[PDB]
Write a protein that binds this ligand. Structure first.
Ligand SMILES: CCCCCCCCCCCCCCCCCC(=O)OC[C@H](COP(=O)([O-])OCC(O)COP(=O)([O-])OC[C@@H](COC(=O)CCCCCCCCCCCCCCCCC)OC(=O)CCCCCCCCCCCCCCCCC)OC(=O)CCCCCCCCCCCCCCCCC
Ligand SMILES: CCCCCCCCCCCCCCCCCC(=O)OC[C@H](COP(=O)([O-])OCC(O)COP(=O)([O-])OC[C@@H](COC(=O)CCCCCCCCCCCCCCCCC)OC(=O)CCCCCCCCCCCCCCCCC)OC(=O)CCCCCCCCCCCCCCCCC
Ligand SMILES: CCCCCCCCCCCCCCCCCC(=O)OC[C@H](COP(=O)([O-])OCC(O)COP(=O)([O-])OC[C@@H](COC(=O)CCCCCCCCCCCCCCCCC)OC(=O)CCCCCCCCCCCCCCCCC)OC(=O)CCCCCCCCCCCCCCCCC
Ligand SMILES: CCCCCCCCCCCCO[C@@H]1O[C@H](CO)[C@@H](O[C@H]2O[C@H](CO)[C@@H](O)[C@H](O)[C@H]2O)[C@H](O)[C@H]1O
Lengths: 90, 133, 44, 108, 112, 140, 226, 207, 140, 207, 140, 60, 52
C-alpha cells in the first residue's frame, strides 16, 4: 500500500520468478503477483485519485467546464499513471 | 456566430417548425431486404504502408520534427488493420457468433412479432431489504 | 427534517442559540411561526 | 501501451459527446460519435456473449459500475443507445473477469 | 421555438424533459437509483451485529437497488449481437452498412 | 414586530452578513491578543502550564448556523415562487369598478400595496398636474 | 513510447464533445454553430439579489479576500434556446463550475472560526452544480425513504416536492435563493399536517345557518360545497 | 490585554542606518535561529488557537443542550422525568414492548408515544429510523396479542434495530477514543516545541 | 437620517374621483355593540366563552392563559419544560474539515460510491496493462 | 491552471461512515506523517510565494525605471547623453569642478546644471544633500578663481560630500551581498524540505 | 441606473423676478469680431502672434506646438525624453517589514534615539542594582 | 470614509484582512468649556491617541 | 475630463480602495492556483527545478 511495500512486493515477484523459470512462473507465482498488483494499485489510486475525480467530474458535466477544455484532463491522469509505473516496476 | 434555425423567426417558427431529427437511419431511402455480403477475410498482407509509415513517423518524432498527432493517426491506422484480423478470427471461431453471422429476418416478421409488449422497465426493490425486513 | 442548513425557515430563532433567557416565555421558537398570523399576537 | 485505459476514457468521452449532440439536435455529430466507438475490440467482442449470460455477483458488480458511470435509463426503443450500453457493459465485464472490482471504501 | 424554461419549471423538466433524438425512459426516470449509503449502512449493521472488519468486508455485496436493466438486452439479444458483428466488421456502420439490423431492431421495438 | 427586530427578521442579508463578520472579527481579535499575552507570560516564566492556563481566560451558546429574514419571503402576482396550485375563480377577489362620463378606474393600474406603479403612462407623466383637481407638490 | 495514442478518438475522428470544442478546433459538425457562454456566466461570485437590500447586485462580503466580479444571470435570452435541457438551463442562473469565491485558508483555526460564526461550509464553497442525474437519484432515494417512513400519509408528496425544488434550485450553493423557492411547499406541508391531524382526531365546529343573501341572485345556482 | 504600539522615529530615517559592511557568520547563524523561532511560534499559535476555539464552541454547545434539556445515547440528564427516562433507555438499550397488563387503548397510546419520541429524535438521514419505525409498526399490528406471540413476529425487525443501535454506540466510543489520542499527541508535540523554543532563546544572540 | 423626512412624492386628487363623505361626516362617529353585549350577557347569565377559564383543554400538553388586562385579550402559554432527545452519536462529524481530500472510508463516503466505483474501474484497467507489461518483461 | 472541485455525495451521509473501532498504531503514525507533510507544504508555499511576489515586483520596478530613463549610483543606462553621463559620474565618483577654459557665464551655467541635477536626484531626507549643496555653493562663491586657489577653500566640504558618497556606495554593496546570502540560505532550506517531503511520500500509507 | 432620470426637483419662477429678455430676443443672435479681425490682419500683413510658429522659445527645453485644425488652438509638447537620476542606494529598505520589532541598529533607528536612550538609562539603573546585589552576595 | 460625495460615507474602510467595523466618532457637539485646550486633549476630538483598531496580524 | 477619469480622479476613495482590493484578490488567486499546479507537477516528477 506504501511505495516501499509495493517495491518489496515486486522484488519478491522477480526473485521468485527467476527461481521458478519462464515455463512455470504463471502457475507458481500467482499470489505474489496479485499482492504486487494490489499494492501498486493502491499507490496509483493515492497518487492519481485527484486527476481521476477531475475527469469523472468533467464527464458528468459533459466537458463543459474550464478545466475540462483541451486534453489536459486526460493527459494528466495518463502521465500520473506512467510515472507511478516507471517508479514501481523497474 | 450562431446559424439560426428560423431566420424568419416570427413567421418560420409558426408556419414551418423544424421537427425532431431521426438518427437511426436516413429514412429517405429504400430499406434493404438483404444483409451485407460477407467481406473478404483479411490478413497481415495489407499492413505494409501502415507499418512502414508508422516506423518512419516514429523515427522522425524521435528526432522531434514530426509531432504527436501524426504518430497517433499512423498508430491507429495500423492498429485498425490488426484489429480487422483479430475480429475476423473471433467471429469465425467463437460459436456464439455463428448464428449472428447467418442471421436473417424480414420486416414483415419484425412487424408481426409481439415482444414489444414486454419492453416495460421493471421496478426497483424496496429499501427495507437492506435491513432485511 | 432532511436539509437543516439549507432550510432556514424551519430553524430556531437566534435567541435560541444564546443559552440565556409566574410562567416564563418558551425558550425554543422556530422561524416557521412567521407563516402564522396569530402565533405571537392574540386572537382578541 | 495503455490500451484498456485509453479505450475506456475514449468511450466515456464519446458517450458524453452523443448526449450533448442529442441535446443540441446534431445527427451528424452523434452518428460520428456512434461510429468512433471502438467496435473493433476483440476482447470486448468475446466478452459480450459472456456478459449476456452471466448471473449473480459478477453481474451485480458490473451493473453497479455501469450505474455509476451511466445511471440514466436509456430508451428501450433506441437501438443505438442500447448497443452502446451493451458495449460499455461488455468492456467492464472483461475488465472485471480479468481483475475483479473492489467497490467498497473499506478494504485492505 | 425552443423557449427558455424558468427556474420554477425545472422540477417538471427533470421528470418530463423535452424531446430529443436520444430520449430517456421518462416512465422509468423515477426508478433510477444509486445508493451512496449502501456500504456504510452494511458495515454499520454488521459491526452492530458483532462481526469484525474482515468479516464485514468478506460478507459485503454490491447494491441490487440500482437502476433496472434494459429489457431489450434480454429480448433483442440475437439482433443486437448481429448488429455488433456488423459494426465490428464494417467500421461502426459507416455509409449505412448496418441499416438492415438496426431497422429490424427499430421495427421490432416500435411497431409503427 | 419588536420581537422580530431583535431576531434580525427585518434586516437584509447584507446586514445579517455584516453582523456575522463583526462577531467574527471581534472574536478573532480577542483570541490573537490573548495569544500574544499568553506567549509573553509563558516566555518570561518558561512554563507551558501558563499557556495552558490562558485557555480559560475568556461560552454562552453558539452563533446561529442559519438565518431567515423577511426579504426571503416571495411576493408577486405573477411570481411563480408563490404558486403551488391554482386558486379557483370563485375564491379570487374582484378589483374595484368605476366608470362614468367624468372618471373611471380602467385607464390605469395603481398596483398592489407593495408592488405599486404609476397609473398614468409615459407621455402624460410630465403633465400629471393637468389631470388633477388639486395638487400639493413636494418639499425640496 | 507516445502517451495516450488510443485515448483521443475525438481528435482522430473529428468528433466535438460540445459546440465550444467544435468552434475551437474547427471541426464544423454542429449545423447551428455556437453561441458562446460569456465569462460572466461561466464564472463569478455570489451577489445580493433583493431590491430591498442596499447592496443589491453587489458581491457578498466574506472574511477572506475574494474577487468581486459577479455572476450575471441571463436576463435577455435569445428566443431559440435549442437545448432546453437542465444542462443548458442551469447556466442561466448558476455557474456549472461553482462560484469563484472559495477560500484557501492559511491555517486550520481560521477555517474553524469561519465555520463557528457561520461564514464557511465546504458543502457550499468547494463544490460544483449538481447534474440532473444526481438530482434525480437524490430525489428518488429520499422518496423511497419517505414512503418507507409512512405510506398512509397525505403530506408525503409535498415533502418530496420541497426536497425536489431545493435540489433543482441548488440549495447547497445558494440556500437562501432556494429556500425562497421552496418555502411554498413547506407551507403546503404545514397545512396538510393540520388537515391530517384534524381528520385523525375528529375536530369540527358548529356551522352557522345559511345567510339570507348566500345567493347573490335568485336565478343563480348555489353550488354545494362540503 | 494588549500592549501599546511601539515608538517610531519623528525624523525620517530613509537608508542612513543601513549597514555599510556585509554580515558575519554569527549574525547569519542568529538570523537562521530567528527564522526557526518564528516558525515554532507559528506552530504553537495554530495549536493554541484551534484548541481554544474548539473548547469554547463545545462548551457553548453543551450549555445550549443543557438549556434546552436534551438527552442523547449517553443518558446524562438529571432533569428528566422517570417515565421519559425509562422510555428513552428502552429505545437506546432495551426492548420497547407493550405489557399485557395494559388495556388495548393504553397499548396504542404507549406505541404512539414511542413513535412520536423516536421520530422527533431520529431524522430521515438517520440510519436507525427505518428499523425503529418498522418495529413500532409491527407492534401496532400486534397490539391485540401477548408478548410471547409478538416476539416471533417482531424479532426480525428488532434485530436490525438493535444492530443499528449498537453500531451508533460503537461509533460514539471510537470517536471519544480517537479524539483523546489525537489531542494528547498534539499537546505533546506543542510541549516539545515549547522546550525547543526555550533552548533556542537561551542560545539567541543580539540586543 | 431617516426620521423627519421631506415630502418625496406629490399629493393630488384626480378629476371627478369620488369621496363618499357627506358634510356631517365629521360629526358622525363609530360604535360597536360588543360592550353592551358583554354587559347584557353578564347580567343575564348567558353562556360564557371558555376564554374566561385560564386552563386550556385544547391540547394534550398543559397551557395557561395570560391575560392583557381583559378576558377578551389572552394568549396561551405552555407550562412544560419539554425534554428533547437525539438518537445521534457525538464526535462523529467535523463539518469544517473538507473530507473529500482525506484518504479513507469517511473521505470516500463524503465523496460518492460513483467516484469510488470509477476509481476501482481505473484500478482494474491499470492492473491489466501492468500485468501485460510484467509478462513481456519477464518472458525476455 | 486549476482543477475542478471534487465530487460530493448526492445522498446525505451524516455519520453512517464513521469508524466503529478505535484507530491502530500504523494509522496513528500515518496521521502524524500527514501532519508533518502539511507543515512542510506550508513552509514551501511561504518560500515560493514570497520569492514569486518579490521577483515580479522588482522586475516591474526595473521596467518602470528603464521606461522613465533613470540612472543610479551604478551607472547602467545606455540611453544617456555623454554629457549627462559625465556630469553624473562626476557627482558620484569624481570631483565636480569648473574649468579655467570656460568663461564666467559658462561656469555659472555649469554650476547651475550641477545644482539642478543634484537637487532633483537627492531629496531633503538624503544625507548627502547638504554636503553637495554646500560644495556647489562654495563653487558659486569661487567662480572667479582658478582650480588651484579653489581647492584650498572647497576641500573641507568636498571631504564630507565624498564621505557620504562612499558611504552610500558601501551600503549598496553590503545590501547586495547580504541579500544574496539570505536568498541562497532560504533556497537551500526549501530544497531540503522538498527532499524530506519526497521521502515522507515514499513512506506514506493509505489509499 | 443613471441615464434618463426623472424630474427630482420642481421648476418654478418666483413672483415678479425679472427676465431681462425682450420679445425680439429669439431673433437676436451673437457675433464676434475675431474672424473679421483675422481676415483683416492677414490681408494687411499686420503683426502676427508667435503661435503661428511651431517652435517654442518660452523655455530652455525643446517644445513643439500641436495644432487642432487651426493656429488659434494649440498646445506645446516637449520633445526631450528626459533622463532622471537618483542619488540613492538599492536594496537598503524593506518597508513592508516592521523594523521596530527586529533587534539591531536598523531597528533602533526605525525606532528613535529617545527610546534607545531610555533603554540605556534603564540598563544603567539595572546594572547599579545588580552590582549592589553582587556585592552583598559575595561579601557573605 | 468622510466625504458626502462618497456612497459609503461614515462607513468603515475595507481592507484585505478582517477588521472590526466600529468606527471612531469625532466630537461633533463638544461642550462649551474644554478646560484643557492643549494638543493632548484636542487631538482626541479627531483621532484616537492609541491609533485605530484596524491593524493586521498576518499569518504569513 | 476623460483623461482624469482614466486615472480615477472622479472616483471616490471607496471606489479607489475597491479597485485596489480587486487587483489584490485577482493576483492572490493567480498565485495560489499557480502554486497548486507547480506543487502537483513537482510532486509527480519529484524535482525541485520544476517548482523553480
Ligand atoms: C365583465 C363585463 C363588465 C361590463 C361592464 C358592465 C357595467 C356594469 C353593469 C351595467 C348594468 C346597466 C346599468 C345601467 C348603467 C348604470 C349607469 C350608472 O350607474 O351611472 C353611474 C355613473 C357614475 O357613477 P360613479 O361611480 O359615481 O362615477 C363617479 C361620479 O359620477 C363622479 O361624479 P363627479 O365628480 O364627476 O360630479 C358629477 C356631477 C354632475 O352633476 C351635474 O352635472 C350638475 C351640473 C349642474 C349645473 C347647472 C345647474 C343649474 C341649476 C342650479 C340650481 C340652483 C342653484 C343652487 C346652487 C347649488 C346648485 C348649483 O354630480 C352629479 O353627477 C350629480 C347627479 C345628480 C343630479 C342629476 C341632475 C339630473 C337633472 C336632469 C334634468 C333633465 C332636464 C331635461 C330637459 C330636456 C330639454 C327640454 O353615472 C355617471 O356617468 C355620472 C354622470 C351622469 C351624468 C349626469 C349629468 C346631469 C346633468 C344635468 C344637467 C341639466 C341641465 C340641462 C340644461 C338643458 C336645458 C336648458
Ligand atoms: C344633461 C343630462 C340630462 C339627463 C340626466 C341623466 C341622468 C339621469 C339619472 C340621474 C343621475 C344619476 C347619476 C348617478 C348619481 C351618482 C353620482 C352622485 O350622486 O354623486 C356624485 C357627487 C360626488 O360627490 P362626492 O365627492 O363623492 O361626495 C359624496 C357625498 O356623499 C355627497 O356630497 P356632499 O354631501 O358633500 O354635498 C352635499 C351638499 C349639498 O347638500 C344639499 O344641498 C342637500 C339638499 C338640499 C336641497 C334643497 C335646498 C335648496 C335651497 C335653495 C335656496 C337657495 C336660495 C335661493 C336663491 C335663488 C337665486 C338663485 O352639501 C353642501 O354643499 C353644504 C350644504 C349644507 C347645508 C344643506 C342643508 C340645509 C338645507 C337648507 C339650506 C339652509 C342654509 C342655512 C345656512 C345656515 C344659516 C344659519 O355627489 C355630489 O356631489 C352630491 C352633490 C351634487 C350636487 C350637484 C349640484 C347640481 C344640483 C342640480 C342638479 C340639476 C337640477 C335639475 C333641475 C332641478 C333643480 C332646479
Ligand atoms: C402708483 C405709482 C405712481 C408713481 C409712479 C412712480 C414711478 C416713477 C418711476 C418710473 C418707473 C420706473 C420703475 C423702474 C423701471 C424698471 C422696471 C422695468 O422697466 O421692467 C419691469 C418689467 C420686467 O419685465 P422682464 O420680465 O424683466 O422683461 C424685460 C424686457 O426687457 C421687457 O419686457 P418685454 O419686451 O417682453 O415687454 C414688452 C411688451 C410691450 O411692448 C410694447 O408695448 C412696446 C411699446 C409700444 C407702446 C405703443 C403702442 C400702443 C398701442 C395702443 C393701441 C391699442 C389699441 C387701442 C385700444 C383702445 C381701447 C383700450 O411686448 C409685448 O407684450 C408684445 C408686443 C409686440 C408688439 C409691440 C410692437 C408693435 C407696436 C404697435 C402695435 C401693432 C401690433 C400689430 C400686431 C401685428 C398685426 C399684423 O418690464 C416689463 O414688463 C416691460 C413691459 C411693462 C409694461 C407695463 C404695462 C403697463 C403700461 C402702462 C404703464 C402706466 C401708464 C401710465 C399712463 C400712460 C399710458 C396711458
Ligand atoms: C324599544 C323597542 C325595541 C324593539 C326591538 C325589536 C327587536 C327586533 C329584533 C329582530 C332581530 C332579528 O335578527 C335577524 O333575524 C333573522 C331571522 O329572523 C336572522 O336569521 C337570518 O340570518 C341568519 C344568518 O345570517 C340565519 O338565521 C338565516 O339565514 C336568516 O333567517 C338574522 O341572523 C338576524 O340578524
Amino acid at each position: 500500500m506504501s511505495v516501499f511495500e509495493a517495491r518489496s512486493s515486486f522484488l519478491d515477484l522477480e526473485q521468485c520468478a527467476r527461481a521458478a523459470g519462464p515455463q512455470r512462473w504463471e502457475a507458481e507465482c500467482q499470489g505474489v503477483r496479485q499482492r504486487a498488483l494490489q499494492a501498486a494499485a493502491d499507490v496509483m489510486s493515492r497518487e492519481c485519485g485527484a486527476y481521476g475525480d477531475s475527469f469523472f467530474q468533467c464527464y458528468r458535466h459533459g466537458f463543459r467546464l474550464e478545466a475540462c477544455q483541451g486534453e489536459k484532463a486526460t493527459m494528466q491522469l495518463l502521465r500520473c499513471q506512467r510515472m507511478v509505473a516507471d517508479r514501481l516496476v523497474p | 456566430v450562431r446559424n439560426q434555425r428560423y431566420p424568419a423567426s416570427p413567421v418560420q417558427e409558426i408556419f414551418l417548425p423544424e421537427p425532431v431529427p431521426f438518427v437511426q437511419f436516413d429514412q429517405t431511402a429504400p430499406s434493404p431486404n438483404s444483409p451485407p455480403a460477407p467481406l473478404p477475410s483479411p490478413s497481415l498482407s495489407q499492413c505494409e504502408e501502415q507499418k512502414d509509415r508508422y516506423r518512419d513517423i516514429s523515427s522522425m518524432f524521435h528526432r522531434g520534427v514530426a509531432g504527436a498527432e501524426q504518430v497517433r493517426e499512423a498508430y491507429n491506422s495500423m492498429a485498425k488493420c490488426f484489429r480487422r484480423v483479430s475480429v475476423a478470427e473471433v467471429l469465425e471461431s467463437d460459436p456464439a457468433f455463428r448464428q449472428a453471422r447467418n442471421f436473417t429476418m424480414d420486416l414483415k416478421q419484425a412487424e408481426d412479432d409481439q415482444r414489444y409488449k414486454q419492453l416495460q422497465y421493471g421496478r426497483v426493490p424496496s429499501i427495507l431489504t437492506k435491513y432485511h425486513l | 427534517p432532511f436539509m437543516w442548513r439549507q432550510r432556514a425557515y424551519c430553524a430556531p430563532v437566534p435567541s435560541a442559540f444564546a443559552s440565556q433567557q409566574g410562567v416564563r416565555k418558551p425558550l425554543l421558537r422556530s422561524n416557521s411561526e412567521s407563516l402564522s398570523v396569530f402565533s405571537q399576537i392574540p386572537d382578541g | 501501451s495503455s490500451p484498456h485505459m485509453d479505450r475506456l476514457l475514449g468511450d466515456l468521452k464519446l458517450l458524453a459527446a452523443y448526449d450533448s449532440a442529442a441535446g443540441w439536435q446534431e445527427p451528424k455529430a452523434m452518428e460520428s460519435a456512434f461510429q468512433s466507438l471502438s467496435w473493433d475490440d476483440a476482447d470486448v467482442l468475446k466478452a459480450l456473449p459472456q456478459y449476456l449470460n452471466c448471473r449473480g455477483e459478477q453481474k451485480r458488480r458490473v451493473d453497479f459500475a455501469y450505474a455509476a458511470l451511466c445511471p440514466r435509463p436509456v430508451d428501450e426503443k433506441d437501438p443505438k443507445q442500447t448497443l452502446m450500453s451493451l458495449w460499455m457493459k461488455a468492456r467492464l465485464f472483461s475488465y472485471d473477469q480479468k481483475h475483479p472490482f473492489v467497490l467498497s471504501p473499506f478494504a485492505a | 421555438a425552443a423557449s427558455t424554461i424558468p427556474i420554477s419549471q425545472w422540477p417538471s423538466l427533470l421528470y418530463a424533459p423535452p424531446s430529443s433524438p436520444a430520449n430517456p425512459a421518462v416512465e422509468a426516470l423515477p426508478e433510477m437509483q444509486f445508493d451512496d449509503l449502501h456500504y456504510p449502512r452494511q458495515m454499520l449493521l454488521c459491526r452492530g451485529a458483532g462481526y469484525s472488519l474482515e468479516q464485514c468486508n468478506r460478507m459485503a455485496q454490491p447494491d441490487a437497488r440500482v437502476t433496472p436493466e434494459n429489457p431489450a438486452e434480454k429480448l433483442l439479444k440475437e439482433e443486437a449481437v448481429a448488429a455488433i458483428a456488423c459494426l465490428s466488421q464494417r467500421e461502426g456502420g459507416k455509409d449505412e452498412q448496418c441499416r438492415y439490423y438496426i431497422e429490424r431492431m427499430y421495427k421490432l421495438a416500435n411497431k409503427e | 414586530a419588536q420581537l422580530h427586530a431583535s431576531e434580525g427578521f427585518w434586516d437584509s442579508e447584507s446586514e445579517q452578513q455584516e453582523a456575522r463578520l463583526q462577531r467574527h472579527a471581534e472574536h478573532r481579535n480577542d483570541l490573537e491578543t490573548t495569544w500574544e499575552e499568553a506567549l509573553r507570560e509563558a516566555t518570561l516564566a518558561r512554563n507551558f502550564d501558563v499557556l495552558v492556563s490562558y485557555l480559560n481566560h475568556g461560552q454562552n451558546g453558539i452563533p446561529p448556523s442559519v438565518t431567515w429574514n423577511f426579504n426571503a419571503m416571495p411576493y408577486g402576482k405573477e411570481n411563480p415562487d408563490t404558486k403551488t396550485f391554482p386558486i379557483p375563480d370563485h375564491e379570487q377577489p374582484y378589483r374595484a369598478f368605476s366608470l362614468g362620463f367624468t372618471a373611471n378606474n380602467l385607464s390605469g393600474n395603481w398596483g398592489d400595496y407593495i408592488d405599486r406603479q404609476d397609473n398614468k403612462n409615459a407621455l402624460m407623466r410630465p403633465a400629471r398636474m393637468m389631470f388633477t383637481d388639486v395638487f400639493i407638490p413636494t418639499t425640496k | 513510447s507516445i502517451l495516450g495514442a488510443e485515448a483521443f478518438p475525438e481528435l482522430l475522428s473529428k468528433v466535438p464533445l460540445n459546440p465550444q470544442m467544435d468552434e475551437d478546433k474547427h471541426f464544423n459538425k454542429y449545423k447551428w454553430g455556437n453561441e458562446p457562454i460569456p465569462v460572466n456566466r461561466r464564472t463569478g461570485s455570489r451577489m445580493n439579489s433583493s431590491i430591498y437590500d442596499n447592496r443589491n447586485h453587489e458581491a457578498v462580503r466574506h472574511p477572506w479576500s475574494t474577487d468581486a466580479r459577479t455572476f450575471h444571470p441571463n436576463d435577455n435570452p435569445e428566443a431559440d434556446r435549442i437545448n432546453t435541457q437542465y444542462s443548458n438551463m442551469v447556466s442561466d442562473s448558476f455557474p456549472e463550475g461553482g462560484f469563484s469565491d472559495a477560500p484557501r485558508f492559511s491555517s486550520n483555526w481560521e477555517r474553524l472560526l469561519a465555520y463557528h460564526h457561520g461564514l464557511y461550509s465546504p458543502e457550499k464553497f468547494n463544490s460544483t452544480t449538481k447534474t440532473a442525474d444526481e438530482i434525480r437519484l437524490a430525489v428518488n432515494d429520499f422518496a423511497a425513504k419517505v414512503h418507507a417512513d409512512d405510506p398512509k400519509n397525505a403530506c408525503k408528496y409535498l415533502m418530496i416536492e420541497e426536497f425536489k425544488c431545493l435540489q433543482s434550485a441548488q440549495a447547497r450553493i445558494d440556500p437562501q435563493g432556494a429556500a425562497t423557492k421552496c418555502v411554498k411547499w413547506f407551507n403546503e406541508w404545514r397545512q396538510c399536517a393540520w388537515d391530517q391531524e384534524k381528520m385523525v382526531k375528529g375536530y369540527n365546529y358548529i356551522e352557522d345557518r345559511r345567510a339570507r343573501k348566500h345567493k347573490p341572485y335568485i336565478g343563480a345556482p348555489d353550488l354545494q360545497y362540503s | 490585554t494588549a500592549l501599546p504600539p511601539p515608538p517610531s522615529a519623528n525624523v525620517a530615517v530613509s537608508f542612513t542606518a543601513a549597514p555599510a559592511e556585509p554580515l558575519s557568520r554569527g549574525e547569519v547563524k542568529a538570523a537562521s535561529l530567528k527564522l526557526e523561532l518564528q516558525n515554532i511560534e507559528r506552530e504553537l499559535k495554530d495549536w493554541w488557537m484551534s484548541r481554544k476555539i474548539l473548547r469554547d464552541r463545545n462548551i457553548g454547545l453543551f450549555n445550549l443542550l443543557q438549556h434546552h434539556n436534551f438527552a442523547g445515547l449517553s443518558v446524562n440528564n438529571a432533569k428528566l422525568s422517570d417515565s421519559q427516562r425509562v422510555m428513552w433507555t428502552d429505545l437506546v438499550q432495551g426492548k420497547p414492548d407493550v405489557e399485557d397488563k395494559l388495556s388495548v387503548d393504553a397499548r396504542e397510546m404507549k406505541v404512539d408515544m414511542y413513535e412520536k419520541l423516536f421520530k422527533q429524535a431520529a431524522d430521515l438521514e438517520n440510519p436507525c429510523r427505518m428499523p425503529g419505525v418498522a418495529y413500532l409498526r409491527c407492534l401496532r399490528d400486534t397490539l391485540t396479542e401477548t408478548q410471547s406471540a409478538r416476539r416471533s413476529s417482531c424479532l426480525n425487525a428488532f434485530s436490525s434495530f438493535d444492530a443499528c443501535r449498537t453500531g451508533l454506540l460503537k461509533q460514539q466510543s471510537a470517536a471519544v477514543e480517537n479524539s483523546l489520542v489525537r489531542q494528547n499527541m498534539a499537546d505533546v508535540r506543542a510541549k516539545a516545541l515549547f522546550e525547543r523554543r526555550a533552548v533556542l532563546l537561551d542560545l539567541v544572540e543580539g540586543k | 437620517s431617516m426620521d423627519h423626512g421631506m415630502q418625496y412624492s406629490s399629493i393630488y386628487w384626480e378629476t371627478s374621483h369620488r369621496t363618499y363623505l357627506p358634510f356631517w361626516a365629521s360629526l358622525t362617529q363609530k360604535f360597536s355593540w360588543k360592550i353592551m353585549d358583554d354587559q347584557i350577557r353578564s347580567f343575564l347569565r348567558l353562556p360564557k366563552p371558555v376564554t374566561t377559564e385560564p386552563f386550556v383543554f385544547s391540547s394534550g400538553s398543559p397551557y395557561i392563559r395570560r391575560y392583557f388586562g381583559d378576558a377578551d385579550i389572552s394568549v396561551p402559554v405552555p407550562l412544560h419544560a419539554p425534554a428533547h432527545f437525539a438518537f445521534v452519536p457525538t464526535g462523529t462529524v467535523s463539518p469544517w474539515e473538507e473530507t473529500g481530500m482525506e484518504t479513507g472510508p469517511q473521505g470516500a463516503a463524503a465523496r460518492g460510491a460513483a467516484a469510488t466505483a470509477f476509481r476501482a474501474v481505473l484500478e482494474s484497467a491499470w492492473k491489466c496493462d501492468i500485468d501485460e507489461q510484467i509478462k513481456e518483461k519477464l518472458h525476455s
